[PDB]
Amino acid sequence: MFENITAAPADPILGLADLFRADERPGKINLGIGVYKDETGKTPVLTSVKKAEQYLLENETTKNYLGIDGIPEFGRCTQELLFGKGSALINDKRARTAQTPGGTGALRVAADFLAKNTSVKRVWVSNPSWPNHKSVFNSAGLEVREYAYYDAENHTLDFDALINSLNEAQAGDVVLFHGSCHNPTGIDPTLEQWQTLAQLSVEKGWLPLFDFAYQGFARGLEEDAEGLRAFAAMHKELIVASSYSKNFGLYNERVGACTLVAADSETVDRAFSQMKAAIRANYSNPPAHGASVVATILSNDALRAIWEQELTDMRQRIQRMRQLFVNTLQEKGANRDFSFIIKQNGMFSFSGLTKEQVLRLREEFGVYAVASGRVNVAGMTPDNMAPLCEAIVAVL
Amino acid sequence: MFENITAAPADPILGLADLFRADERPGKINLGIGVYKDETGKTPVLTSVKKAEQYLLENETTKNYLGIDGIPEFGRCTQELLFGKGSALINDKRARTAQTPGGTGALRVAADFLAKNTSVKRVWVSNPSWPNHKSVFNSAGLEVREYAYYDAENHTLDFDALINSLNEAQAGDVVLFHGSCHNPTGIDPTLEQWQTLAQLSVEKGWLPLFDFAYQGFARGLEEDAEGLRAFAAMHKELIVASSYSKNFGLYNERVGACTLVAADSETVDRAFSQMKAAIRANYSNPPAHGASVVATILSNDALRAIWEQELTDMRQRIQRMRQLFVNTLQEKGANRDFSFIIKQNGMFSFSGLTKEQVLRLREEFGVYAVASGRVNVAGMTPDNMAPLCEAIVAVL
Ligand SMILES: *Cc1c(COP(=O)(O)O)cnc(C)c1O
Ligand SMILES: *Cc1c(COP(=O)(O)O)cnc(C)c1O
């Protein structure tokens, strides 16, 4: 019965790793990764999570099942992290949150929930977007469309072209927004554009679906959430998928939440129960480890202070590197003006190199980027910074 | 958009917990649970897993993403646990295994994989079966049918009636077998009946789907697998979902694997890639914690020896309790002959009480069982054993 089965197509991101872990050139550099790396080239366990894990090892007495929605604490801290302390939404009991296996698990859960309990048929995802967004949505049965976003020429957010592509979006359609650090491009709407996008959404009838995967990496934990909070203020409904994989360095523990907000308590509840049933037919209940670690940190003044600083360092390292990158080029040749790399947020951004320029980089020079010219800035160190720009300038 | 949403129906198993955690009667007893409990009424963390977790805390240097299939070690030990050491299947490179979030996550993953890459439309699950089996299958789009199993009158496995219901099963149909400790009833096919069921499956063209959730609880780790191994010997294809939640007491860490076997290397591989793509659109990659704990134990002679003993104790406690149960009744009144409870395997079995007898138990006497009359034997202790049978005999 499996003899007819077709090879699944490689992922070139997940498929890119291999040739790196096969190349030999000494200079070898991997800027196609999706995780953060410190100045020494490693993806360390935060000190704060190591402390929370010792606590757990000592205080855990059972590994019995969590509820289907996970750890209550975890759910609350998330809501507070996302919407804020004295939020009208939290006080009105308008939000229910489900602990989920990774930001990805949250997306799929919203997907299966939306797919089977509502009349949603389409989801619009920004033009360049995290490639896996589409696949998560298709597998639920939903159709994915694309709205315009990135100005190929100006390396900016085309606000008009974006809106112009969102008028073809009808009422009960789900629009997907990246809360901060746009995954492929790093270009984020300003606060005025989020307020504008919020208003259009209210009039037009769209159902917002926020993907928060890097809270804390553009400007901070609170600032990074103003857009999401601009919508939360005028919308009666919205869904939000967050991940704690990149901001807690908890990648393989699968920590993320899927938050659902309705018009009032009775509704978020009724709707939440169907969400529970979706989870229940998927993985049954969430993995306690990484999430126990996050509830513990966030609810301990001591540990939380340390984590904030660890987040801040990470964020500051990337900012140190975007700047050092746009400079070393200016010194080592650099035809073009890469000044745009600066103030593009998060670990990524499009270099703007052609697909053929990337190949040449990876083949002669041994620098590994995603064919889209997307580079992970956190994979740059002061040490490899120089050969890196020298091999880029050697291709334009 | 969520105002039309319908209340999801309660789970009465997951919905049964509540009224227990609300009742007041001192004598209060919960035999409707799904987890194991020791003689003191607790679900402890094994000593072996506590040791493996200290190891991890000390030796882990990163929490970076696992592959989509998880931890290789974990995959190998599983294969060896399931098929055996010098297995033709392992040596021929005929099996690929994916670490998954719980036995439930494995089921869904097989489900989405089967749903989208094969011409499977139906799945047959034993008559009384783990209720969540159906929901996992429906959500993939597959249809669930039911084959006969349990002799209401004899408290036995109706071998004929079973087979008689499996002739309506056509060629590319998936038949689901519980490898050991049938979830609701505890009745397991003997080795001759597994060999017979294997042969029928080969001639008729069915695709076996084994659900192993209690390996080690009926007779042992190896014996519990002879059925599965009887099929593995004649089948060119078969799928197996295993869970490590009940045998490692790792309930909330979501540890389970989804094993896929094809006719040969090239095929299991091609097919495996599509399975990877299913996982990839679901949760992206598996939680490392509970699975790291299992690879570490299983690959350490010291720790594995301790675990085996802990498994053996659990298994022996349940056997001590089935026997003590069928006896205390014989002493305290007992109309009927419950001698059938003895040598019914695992933590469960049907008491054979009518749905109205269960209600009366739970309402007057404060004993909590699932309406199907299913009782968890591991929730019985020598201490509560006496009031328990006294309140049962008070209802017949
Ligand atoms: C990383 C990422 C996710 C997936 O998160 P996991 O937490 O690893 O599942 C989802 N969305 C975006 C935009 C991401 O960058
Ligand atoms: C417990 C159980 C499962 C689910 O296992 P988890 O590992 O908790 O997902 C699946 N199948 C059967 C028969 C079970 O008893």
Side-chain angles (χ1 to χ4, degrees), chain A residues 1 43 62 237 252 254 285 288, chain B residues 1 43 62 237 252 254 288:
Chain A
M1 180 127 232
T43 302
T62 199
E237 296 172 339
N252 65 13
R254 312 319 278 137
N285 50 240
Chain B
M1 180 127 232
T43 302
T62 199
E237 296 172 339
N252 65 13
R254 312 319 278 137

Side-chain angles (χ1 to χ4, degrees), chain A residues 102-104 107 130 133 178 183 211 213-214 243 245-246 254, chain B residues 65:
Chain A
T104 306
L107 282 183
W130 181 49
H133 261 153
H178 282 65
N183 185 303
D211 182 359
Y214 302 84
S243 178
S245 306
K246 292 119 180 194
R254 312 319 278 137
Chain B
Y65 297 113

Side-chain angles (χ1 to χ4, degrees), chain A residues 65 283-284, chain B residues 101-105 107 130 133 178 183 211 213-214 243 245-246 254-255:
Chain A
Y65 297 113
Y283 51 80
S284 193
Chain B
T104 306
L107 282 183
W130 181 49
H133 261 153
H178 282 65
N183 185 303
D211 182 359
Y214 302 84
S243 178
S245 306
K246 292 119 180 194
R254 312 319 278 137
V255 193

